[PDB]
Amino acid sequence: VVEYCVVCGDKASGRHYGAVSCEGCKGFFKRSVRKNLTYSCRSNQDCIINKHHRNRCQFCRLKKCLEMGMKMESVQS
Amino acid sequence: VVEYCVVCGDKASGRHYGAVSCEGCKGFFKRSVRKNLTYSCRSNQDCIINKHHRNRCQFCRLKKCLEMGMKMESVQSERKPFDV
DNA sequence: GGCAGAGGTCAAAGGTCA
DNA sequence: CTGACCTTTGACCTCTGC
Ligand SMILES: [Zn+2]
Ligand SMILES: [Zn+2]
Ligand SMILES: [Zn+2]
Ligand SMILES: [Zn+2]
């Protein structure tokens, strides 16, 4: 075995874009990069990413994807 | 393929929170659970719930949502940071 | 062959606002 | 508050190039 997502802590499906991650953070990363979305944090860019609340701040979720080694260049068309 | 809200009998849009429901009963259940709304029935707590009378009693509508198998645990956290 | 890590889909969750 | 109308999520897939 059981690996956990380095982004939100949910059970990871395997490595995606360079990081051990859940289907959730994988899909969120892909769509964020495809559609060239930087988001905006409505609270000081210190939001906690966990399984149950990871959808609260898109900006802090993308920030943690990149901090944890997800690679924009591994997302293709 | 036309199916029907197990709560009010309006035309359903799909499963919502574990029951075949219309957009109204879906939106109502979310709002209710999200804000911890319990209601008060103004008449004996067995108000009839259908398309025409669904807004007559919030308490009997929510109670009927639960009876038909809508799950509060299926309602997620609001998608904003806490106190924003 | 084998399978990791890329792809895709759409039911059911979200949110919006006359 | 309601609900018609809209967007995003993520579990379950398939494809493929080492
Ligand atoms: Zn994750
Ligand atoms: Zn944030
Ligand atoms: Zn209904
Ligand atoms: Zn009542």
- Which of B 5-64 have CB under 7 A of nucleic chain D? 10, 22-25, 27-28, 31, 54-55, 58, 61
Cα gap B7→B72, rounded to integer Å: 15
Residue B22's contacts (CB-CB under 8 Å, 6 or more residues apart) are: B5, B7, B8, B10, B11, B12, B13
Determine the distance in angstroms separating the CA of A10 from the nearest CA of chain B, rounded to an integer. 16
H helix runs in chain B, sequence order: 23-34, 58-67
CB contact under 8 A, B82 and A56: yes
Technique behind the model:
X-ray
CA A34, A40, A43 angle in degrees (round to 5)?
145
In contact, B19 and B68? CB cutoff 8 Å: yes
> Does the CB of A22 fall within 7 Å of any strand D atom?
yes
Delimit the domains of chain A by residue range: 1-77
Instruction: Assess contact for B59 and B5: CB atoms under 8 A.
Output: no
Q: Hey, what are B34's tokens?
A: 């999200």
Judge whether A46 and A10 are in contact, CB under 8 Å: no
